[PDB]
């Protein structure tokens, strides 16, 4: 029954949300440690914001000078390997989060490196201060955990078996990918479409989107993946829409071709959609289809999908469509 | 060859004997049938004298019937030759019984026609015997006319014609006997040649396979054989070059290295060193066979087992420790004669190994794992003359063996090791035995497959021209038989006779148009086309049959001629023509034969009945009209039965031989395909000359095969990063994916080796992740060193490319040297090509003492490609020597 089972792996760059996709898929169809990781994520977020108050070359204006000992406390405990969790620290963190200077510093998060789930947990200081509740599944999906090795999750939906393969995305972990390049049904490439503004945390020079494009170029022309027919999963669509709606940062500012680019005739007419978000998503998708088609031979094909890993309805719809694709593909026409 | 030809006679005797079994059975029916009608003719009982001789004659045929069966079962066939004589004399004597006494008063001349044809058709007597047997009856017919002068009174003339009637039986009879015997000779000769070729190719196939199976155990050779046959339609979807590796458990690994190799290497030259190495390692191979090991490889001065790899054993490490004790004992034995101090050290470990082959050229069985590395380190520990039984093995054997505390500290303290003829007769017999009820029809002798019968029909009749000649002579003789016979319309019957004799000659020239070279090619092609297709020959064979019958009956139609029995024998003289026509099918022969009797049955009843009546009253005698028409169809019955059975048996033998020839050809084709597969594998395993030398005799007669060369370059290529890359987790099966990547690297190297640019370079072996190749082994000038340098540069380029395709960095350490080597096989039982010398050790040392990504080279004898790094000054193993490094061509 090995042939009946389908093997799928999530190859993508760092912080691409593939682990979040795996978690959402797991809870779609089938403790205190998770609480600890939420606390650690919020901890890292607030410590990085406090550090970036002064680390950036352009100084960020502060709040009322009297409310500064809080900044000193966050700076002091940040160096401590075992960060404390007293109510006073949570009061400090809330005081920073309500401050307008800290808000402005957070609005410039693209200059430095910070987890994308910072604001969700920062809005949760008041509820996390009591340290007596259990976060919901949605708050569980906001957790940020580094994936070192490769992991497998057995799956079973509508009497057919599926195999999951979560792998790392950092340049140090890309050497382990070859360990599972044999007899794989399809590749689910995940790309953070909203990371066009930031840069990778390993070199601090190349764009995250440019790194993802290079990774996709390497995967598409791989000699051991000549006939694998990858599937493309654009992620963080809501974040991209929010960033393009704010107007602070633009795709043209990091990609000159975007300004001249125009929306294609074929499009998805979402009722709650703007021309700007459509042109951005279609520019990204057209870039990926261009890099795929330039080397296209007809042996393998790519099917781009727009996905938001946070909400479960988009996940289940895209998963149903991709399941139809994988069934047709296992048909081996 | 009198022995082979006599052997053919023994085979030929049985097939002809099967024909006389029914004919002796046919004869006893003839006596009783004639006896019965004579009894029914007269109410009074016959003469008691009449019954006694026929009683002897009708009883002896039973005896011969019961005598042929026992002799066939007997290996000897002397009585089969006698049975033909016993049968012939019995029927030949019948003439004396009628001529002098009473005997078989029925028939007469016609009965002699039946037997005189019989002694050339079914009797297993040879051709020379047939003439004597045939002449005996013919000369005794001369005795018959003397003992029966009233027969000459019936016809004062035509007595010469009576002899002529019996002359053509000899003429036509030898034609059937000679051609049928000749065709049997070809069938026996062919089936003797085909089995000779099959046995010749089987011994070569078993000898070729026995060398392939000497290395490369069966459980991977089967996989390779299945792979090369292309079991599926196509393998157009492949991403990796595939591997032949498997994982095993509960195995033990031995190791051994000479402690003082370098001290004795400089003392004596290469030849003596190779001699001692071979002696020790051959004794060691014998020990390994004795103690259930199987050696994997011999590298330098190293030798290592795998315990219970292809088959499991409860005490797997026991065999390793026992043969290690044997190692120590053999080292002590060779320590005698105060020759040297080549004592070694042994390390043993037990665990799990991955066994298989890598690459596309020079496949060799190897084992890769972490535990074999533990065994290698245990051997490298030290204390020569003592074994290492580290915890993974001491708890394995038993607590019954006492061992010391183990090494104190000799190796790096990492990972916490925790030390502590007759065939041809059965060839013919099984043909009939299997085909008793098989593809051939039980009676029609027709193959079930339409194509099988069709491909039989396309076979040309090689005696068609000669066979049609026979029909001309007999038709010519009936013309001479009747020409002197009187008739009213002598000329009008001759005009038709001229037309009929021309009608046969018309087919004769058409069927000999190819024989007539002077005639145009178009006519010649038609003659070939006639025999090319069976149906076109069948109608001609049927046609020529009719002309003999039309000529034999038209004389009677002219009669409204006082000798009506002599005109009947002309039809008998036409029934032989059907028997002459061997190739035409049996059931088709019966249909045309049934026409002859039916017409004669219509011409022997009321029509021309009065012409028989005037013959009855003239002869009168004692109720002799039972020898007339009452016996005329009686003669026709036996003649028809004999001719039909002759045709049936001939076709039976022919179809059997054809079917067996087809089966043998199919077997030959399959065996040839297997030979091709084995040849391909053997070519992939070993070089050409070594394989040729080891294929024939002298595989073990010459214990050492070796050869000395003067100008040979040696290269090594190592990948130090693969050890760090290699890891045995659960996601990858046990490191199988790492070995797949290694196989991909080695296969890329091997494919690069196949370019026409690198013809002087041959890959010797691979040592784990190391690649070894030599230059200019076969002299057929210092260009081969340049070829080796270009090969090293191409290896660097290939490793860079595959690093780009993957997502990790790999670096190559290249070591080159040039000098004189000694190339030969060190193991007689398992042939592994290898080279030795001082330049080999220098190359290995230069590879070991080097920097990754750079090529280290000895004294630069070439100016074509520019080098650099002259001031490197690497001490190596021999002595300090400063020489350069190797960049690109420019
Ligand atoms: N707002 C928003 N957040 C998302 C979205 N997708 C993922 N995230 C968040 O981003 C964070 C990073 O996702 P994660 O799954 O850890 O990336 P990763 O690829 O597995 O990280 P790595 O192993 O390559 S280093 C998660 O905490 C997740 O909550 C999204 O579509 N919208
Ligand atoms: C590729 C396999 C791996 C990682 C593990 C292994 O079993 C080896 O192949 C052995 C031990 C193993 O094949 C036995 C022979 C020999 C020659 C001793 C190998 C080398 O030591 C390899 O190391 C090198 C560097 O060649 C090594 C150790 O590398
Ligand atoms: Mg991850």
Automatic annotation (TrEMBL), chain B:
Give all cystine bridges in this chain.
Answer: 293-305, 559-561
**Keywords recorded for this protein, A-Z:** ATP-binding, cAMP biosynthesis, Cell membrane, Cell projection, Coated pit, Cytoplasmic vesicle, Glycoprotein, Lyase, Magnesium, Manganese, Membrane, Metal-binding, Methylation, Nucleotide-binding, Phosphoprotein, Repeat, Synapse, Transmembrane, Transmembrane helix
Per UniProt, ATP binds at 257-262, 299-301, 345, 765, 834-836, 841-845, 881
This protein's gene is called ADCY8
> A Gene Ontology biological process annotation?
cAMP biosynthetic process
Q: What class of enzyme is it?
A: lyase
EC number(s) of the enzyme? 4.6.1.1
Mapped onto the parent protein, the portion here is 165 to 1167 of 1253
Q: What is this protein called?
A: Adenylate cyclase type 8
- The chain positions of domain Guanylate cyclase read 252-379, 713-847
Q: Record's Gene Ontology CC terms?
A: apical plasma membrane; axon; basolateral plasma membrane; caveola; clathrin-coated pit; clathrin-coated vesicle membrane; dendrite; excitatory synapse
What catalytic activity is recorded? ATP = 3',5'-cyclic AMP + diphosphate
What are the names of the required cofactors? Mg(2+); Mn(2+)
Q: Name one GO molecular function term.
A: calcium- and calmodulin-responsive adenylate cyclase activity
Report whether Signal shows up as a keyword of the record. no
Give compartment(s): Apical cell membrane; Basolateral cell membrane; Cell membrane; Cell projection, Dendrite
Q: How does it sit in the membrane?
A: Multi-pass membrane protein
Subcellular location, principal: membrane
The record describes the protein's role as: Catalyzes the formation of cAMP in response to calcium entry leadings to cAMP signaling activation that affect processes suche as synaptic plasticity and insulin secretion. Plays a role in many brain functions, such as learning, memory, drug addiction, and anxiety modulation through regulation of synaptic plasticity by modulating long-term memory and long-term potentiation (LTP) through CREB transcription factor activity modulation.
Provide the family line.
Belongs to the adenylyl cyclase class-4/guanylyl cyclase family.
Segments crossing the lipid bilayer: 21-40, 52-70, 82-102, 132-153, 468-485, 491-513, 534-558, 566-584, 591-611
């Amino acid at each position: 029954v090995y042939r009946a089972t389908h093997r799928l792996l999530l190859l993508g760059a760092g912080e691409s949300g593939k682990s979040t996709i795996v978690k959402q898929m797991r809870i779609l169809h089938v403790k205190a440690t998770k609480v600890q990781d939420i606390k650690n994520n919020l901890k890292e977020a607030i410590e990085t914001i406090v550090a970036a108050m002064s680390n950036l070359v352009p100084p960020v204006e502060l709040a009322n000078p009297e409310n500064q000992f809080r900044v000193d406390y966050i700076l002091s405990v940040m160096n401590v390997p075992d960060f404390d969790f007293p109510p006073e620290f949570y009061e400090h963190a809330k005081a920073l989060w309500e401050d307008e200077g800290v808000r402005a510093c957070y609005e410039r998060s693209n200059e430095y490196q910070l987890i994308d789930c910072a604001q969700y947990f920062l809005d949760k200081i008041d509820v996390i201060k009591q340290d007596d509740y259990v976060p919901s599944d949605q708050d569980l999906l906001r957790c940020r955990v580094l994936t070192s090795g490769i992991f497998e999750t057995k799956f079973q939906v509508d009497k057919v078996n599926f195999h999951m393969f979560d792998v790392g995305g950092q340049r140090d972990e890309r050497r382990k990918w070859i360990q599972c390049f044999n007899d794989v049904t399809a590749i689910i490439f995940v790309v953070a479409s909203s990371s066009y503004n930031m840069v990778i945390r390993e070199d601090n020079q190349t764009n995250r989107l440019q790194e993802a494009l290079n990774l996709f170029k390497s995967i598409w022309n791989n000699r051991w993946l000549r006939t694998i027919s990858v599937i493309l999963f654009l992620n963080k669509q809501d974040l991209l829409a929010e960033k393009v709606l704010a107007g602070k940062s633009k795709i043209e500012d990091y990609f000159p071709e975007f300004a001249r680019y125009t929306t294609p005739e074929d499009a998805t007419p979402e009722p709650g959609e703007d021309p700007r978000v459509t042109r951005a998503k279609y520019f990204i998708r057209d870039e990926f289809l261009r890099i795929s088609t330039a080397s296209g031979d007809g042996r393998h094909y790519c099917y781009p999908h727009f996905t938001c890993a946070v909400d479960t309805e988009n996940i289940r719809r895209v998963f149903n469509d991709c399941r139809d694709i994988i069934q047709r593909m296992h048909l081996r026409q | 060859s009198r022995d082979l030809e006599r052997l053919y006679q023994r085979y030929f005797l049985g097939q002809r004997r099967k024909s006389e079994v029914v004919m002796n059975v046919l004869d006893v029916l003839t006596k009783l049938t004639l006896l019965v009608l004579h009894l029914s003719l007269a109410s009074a009982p016959m003469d008691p004298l009449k019954g006694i001789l026929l009683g002897f004659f009708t009883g002896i045929e039973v005896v011969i019937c019961a005598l042929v069966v026992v002799r066939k079962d007997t290996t000897s066939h002397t009585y089969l030759q006698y049975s033909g004589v016993v049968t012939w004399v019995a029927m030949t004597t019948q003439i004396l019984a009628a001529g002098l006494g009473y005997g078989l008063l029925g028939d007469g001349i016609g009965y002699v026609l039946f037997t005189l044809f019989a002694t050339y058709s079914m009797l297993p007597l040879p051709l020379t015997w047939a003439i004597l047997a045939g002449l005996g009856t013919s000369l005794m017919q001369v005795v018959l006319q003397a003992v029966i002068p009233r027969l000459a009174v019936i016809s004062i003339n035509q007595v010469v014609a009576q002899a002529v009637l019996f002359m053509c039986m000899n003429t036509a009879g030898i034609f059937i006997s000679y051609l049928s015997d000749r065709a049997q000779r070809q069938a026996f000769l062919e089936t003797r040649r085909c089995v000779e070729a099959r046995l010749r190719l089987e011994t070569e196939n078993q000898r070729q396979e026995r060398l392939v199976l000497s290395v490369l155990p069966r459980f991977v050779v089967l996989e390779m054989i299945n792979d090369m046959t292309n079991v599926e339609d196509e393998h157009l979807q492949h991403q990796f070059h595939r591997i032949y590796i498997h994982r095993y458990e509960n195995v033990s690994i031995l190791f051994a290295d000479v402690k003082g190799f370098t001290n004795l290497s400089t003392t004596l030259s290469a030849q003596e060193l190779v001699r001692m190495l071979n002696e020790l390692f051959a004794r060691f191979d014998r020990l390994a066979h004795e103690h259930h090991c199987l050696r994997i490889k011999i590298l330098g001065d190293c030798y290592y087992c795998v315990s219970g790899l292809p088959e499991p054993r409860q005490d797997h490490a026991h065999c390793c420790v026992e043969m290690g004790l044997s190692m120590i004992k053999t080292i002590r034995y060779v320590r005698s004669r105060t020759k040297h101090d080549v004592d070694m050290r042994i390390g043993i470990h037990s665990g799990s190994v991955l066994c298989g082959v890598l690459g596309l050229r020079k496949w060799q069985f190897d084992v890769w794992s972490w535990d074999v590395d533990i065994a290698n380190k245990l051997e490298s520990g030290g204390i020569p003359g003592r074994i290492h039984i580290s915890k993974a093995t001491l708890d394995c054997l038993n607590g019954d063996y006492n061992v010391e505390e183990g090494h104190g500290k000799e190796r790096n303290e990492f990972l916490r090791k925790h030390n502590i003829k007759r065939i041809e007769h059965t060839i013919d017999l099984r043909s009939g035995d299997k085909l008793r009820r098989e593809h051939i029809k039980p009676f029609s002798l027709m193959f079930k497959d339409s194509s099988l019968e069709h491909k039989y029909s396309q076979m040309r009749d090689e005696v068609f021209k000669s066979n049609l000649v026979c029909a001309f002579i007999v038709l010519l003789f009936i013309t001479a038989i009747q020409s002197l016979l009187p008739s009213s319309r002598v000329m009008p019957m001759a005009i038709q006779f001229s037309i009929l004799i021309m009608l046969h000659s018309a087919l004769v020239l058409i069927t000999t148009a190819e024989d007539y070279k002077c005639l145009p090619l178009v006519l010649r092609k038609t003659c070939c086309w006639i025999n090319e297709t069976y149906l076109a020959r069948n109608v001609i064979i049927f046609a020529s049959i009719l002309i003999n019958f039309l000529g034999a009956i038209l004389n009677i139609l002219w009669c409204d001629c006082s000798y009506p029995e002599y005109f009947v024998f002309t039809g008998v003289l036409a029934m032989v023509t059907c028997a002459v026509f061997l190739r035409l099918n049996s059931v088709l022969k019966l249909a045309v034969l049934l026409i002859m009797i039916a017409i004669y049955a219509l011409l022997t009843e009321t029509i021309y009945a009065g012409l028989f009546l005037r013959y009855d009253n003239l002869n009168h005698s004692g109720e002799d009209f039972l020898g007339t028409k009452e016996a005329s169809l009686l003669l026709m019955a036996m003649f028809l039965l004999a001719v039909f059975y002759h045709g049936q048996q001939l076709e039976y033998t022919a179809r059997l031989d054809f079917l067996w020839r087809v089966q043998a050809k199919e077997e030959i084709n399959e065996m040839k395909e297997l030979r091709e597969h084995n040849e391909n594998m053997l070519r992939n395993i070993l070089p050409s000359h070594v394989a040729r030398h080891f294929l024939e005799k002298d595989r073990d007669n010459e214990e050492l095969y070796s050869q000395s060369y003067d100008a040979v370059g040696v290269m090594f290529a190592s990948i130090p990063g693969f050890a760090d890359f290699y890891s045995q987790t659960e996601m990858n099966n046990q490191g199988v994916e790492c070995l797949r990547l290694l196989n991909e690297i080695i296969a890329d190297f091997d494919e690069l080796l196949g370019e026409d640019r690198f013809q002087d370079i041959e890959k010797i072996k691979t040592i784990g992740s190391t690649y070894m190749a030599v230059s200019g082994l076969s002299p057929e000038k210092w260009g081969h060193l340049c070829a080796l340098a270009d090969f090293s540069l191409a290896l660097t380029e290939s490793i860079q490319e595959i690093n780009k395709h993957s997502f990790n960095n790999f670096e190559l350490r290249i070591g080159i040297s040039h000098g004189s080597v000694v190339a030969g096989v060190i193991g007689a039982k398992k042939p592994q090509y290898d080279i030795w010398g001082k330049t080999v050790n220098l190359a290995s040392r230069m590879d070991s003492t080097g920097v990754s990504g750079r090529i280290q080279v000895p004294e630069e004898t070439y100016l074509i490609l520019k080098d650099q790094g002259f001031a490197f000054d690497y001490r190596g193993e021999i002595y300090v020597k400063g020489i350069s490094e190797q960049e690109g061509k420019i």
